[PDB]
């Protein structure tokens, strides 16, 4: 399985649904037999420039080893679900320092 | 007869001409003046002294409003902004900050080729 | 794809065929067939009301689902078929409870694909949903004008509708003409664009192909007489007045739209 790193921002309005989608995404990876190397929730965080005319946003990082099929399904899920304003899934620079 | 006393000067300066516009903090413009309304044509309005006259006339137009403190936002490559802040400070507003909002794009759109001479 | 014919004869010199090997070779589904008799150029008063319509090939009407229903029942797509009644191809689909229906076939649809129609349906080409479960920016087709009526927009081959905005109860749509119009958000729409996008690439090659389509010859008013057309007459070729319809209304320019109850729905006129 291939390593990846996913950072996504959630609405402050839908900031109460963040542990639910964390459970959903970890359930999807563990059902596709991948693992989560890291998972960090930075909470509500001030953003440098406003996007969607919106206030400070909820930040989640995860390092995830998973097949590229379920990573593509995760990225299309991030596309179709409008609760996430922005997502970045990146393969490169894997095996980062833990909790940085 | 305005009580909020906060204004913004917008100085659109360019190699032909400058335009000074005093507005409120929300973007609704209160007054404006320019080198052409000040009485200069061509090179005489591209001179920075015409910008000083334009800013003095714009400050005269806003003296009815009575703005105490005035932000400054300059825009463009014109020679007249450097006299426009001096003319507004000689008029008597308190300049809290000076900002440069000239459009420095990325590559973006293709520039013209005109005036090769 | 497109097939340029060899010029073994004039009439085969200039014809391009579009052929789909994926289309079904054989009879259509007989429970979804109805009788279609030719009636163009024939009012109930018996007069020709639309000109240049006459005899073509005999055709049978296929009952195609436009108001798509059976919400929550997935349907597997069998072989795509040919439809004479429209430029698009159609797909015979089989629901899980044993019901076969005809669907306007989208661009990526193959035999064996799963489609669904409900409000819980996953957004995917071939699936239909009301436009409040469909994201803004997606290209749709077979979209209703009223909730429950059936698809009236983007039914031709290769056509699509862009979902541009949302009012909150209405959805702004960019149509294939370039027009922006407001359609209620409870109106359903099938995702993706309509297949057979190579339909506009066919060239008929000869007059006989238009006659098989059913298009009678078009006579020019300049070729007619002054009694027949407003154009017409002269001892040469030039008439020399402003171009009009056969009934006198000017035909180059002269927008003719007299609706006033839908002007609240059309937002930007087509260009």
């Amino acid at each position: 399985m291939r390593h990846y790193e996913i950072v996504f921002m959630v609405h402050p309005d839908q900031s109460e649904q963040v542990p639910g989608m964390i459970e959903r995404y970890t359930a999807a990876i563990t059902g596709a037999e991948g693992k989560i190397h890291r998972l960090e929730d930075w909470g509500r965080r001030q953003l440098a420039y406003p996007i969607n005319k919106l206030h400070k946003a909820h930040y989640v990082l995860m390092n995830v080893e998973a097949p590229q099929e379920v990573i593509d399904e995760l990225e299309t899920t991030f596309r179709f679900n409008d609760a996430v304003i922005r997502s970045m899934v990146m393969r490169t620079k894997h095996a980062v320092t833990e909790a940085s | 007869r305005k009580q909020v006393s906060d204004g913004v000067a917008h100085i659109h300066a360019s190699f032909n001409n400058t335009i000074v516009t005093i507005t409120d903090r929300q973007g609704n413009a209160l007054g404006w003046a320019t080198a052409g309304g000040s009485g200069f044509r061509g090179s005489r309005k591209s001179t920075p002294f015409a910008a000083q006259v334009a800013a003095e006339r714009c400050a005269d137009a806003v003296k009815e409003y009575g703005i105490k403190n005035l932000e400054v936002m300059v825009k463009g490559p014109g020679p007249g902004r450097e006299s426009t802040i001096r003319a507004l400070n000689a008029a008597g507003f308190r300049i809290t900050n000076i900002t440069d909002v000239t459009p420095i794009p990325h590559n973006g759109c293709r520039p013209p080729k005109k005036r090769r001479v | 794809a497109v097939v340029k014919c060899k010029p073994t004869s004039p009439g085969r010199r200039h014809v391009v065929k579009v052929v789909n090997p994926e289309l079904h070779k054989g009879k259509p589904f007989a429970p979804l067939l109805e009788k279609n008799s030719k009636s163009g150029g024939r009012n109930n008063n018996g007069r020709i009301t639309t000109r240049h319509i006459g005899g073509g090939h005999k055709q049978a009407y296929r009952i195609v689902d436009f108001k798509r229903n059976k919400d929550g029942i997935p349907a597997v797509v069998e072989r795509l078929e040919y439809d004479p009644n429209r430029s698009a191809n159609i797909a015979l689909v089989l629901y899980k409870d044993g019901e076969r229906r005809y669907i306007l076939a989208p661009k990526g649809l193959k035999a064996g694909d799963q489609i669904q129609s409900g409000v819980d349906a996953a957004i995917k080409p071939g699936n239909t949903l009301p436009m409040r479960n469909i994201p803004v920016g997606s290209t749709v087709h077979n979209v209703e004008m009223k909730p429950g009526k059936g698809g009236q927009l983007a039914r031709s081959a290769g056509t699509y509708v862009q979902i541009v905005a949302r009012d909150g109860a209405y959805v702004t749509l960019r149509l294939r003409s370039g027009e922006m119009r407001k359609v209620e958000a409870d109106c359903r729409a099938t995702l993706g664009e309509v297949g057979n996008a190579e339909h506009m690439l066919r060239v008929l090659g000869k007059a006989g192909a238009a006659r098989w389509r059913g298009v009678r010859p078009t006579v020019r008013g300049t070729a007619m007489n002054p009694v027949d057309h407003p154009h017409g007459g002269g001892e040469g070729r030039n008439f020399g007045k402003h171009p009009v319809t056969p009934w006198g209304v000017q035909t180059k320019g002269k927008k003719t739209r007299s609706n006033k109850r839908t002007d609240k729905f059309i937002v930007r006129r087509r260009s």
Binding site: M9, L47, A48, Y49, A57, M88, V96, T97, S100 | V101 | -
Partner: protein, 55 residues
Amino acid sequence: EIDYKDIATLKNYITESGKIVPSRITGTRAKYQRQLARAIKRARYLSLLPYTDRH
């Protein structure tokens, strides 16, 4: 060596307008300057750093 997730180092390596300062001013190596520019662009995309100070 260079990661885009922290912000203090990356604000030390940008200027006030959000631009990347040149390697001839910073003194950093070329490989680390390229990695720095890539991390700055990724942080700008995730809005941890601004593209410009005007908006």
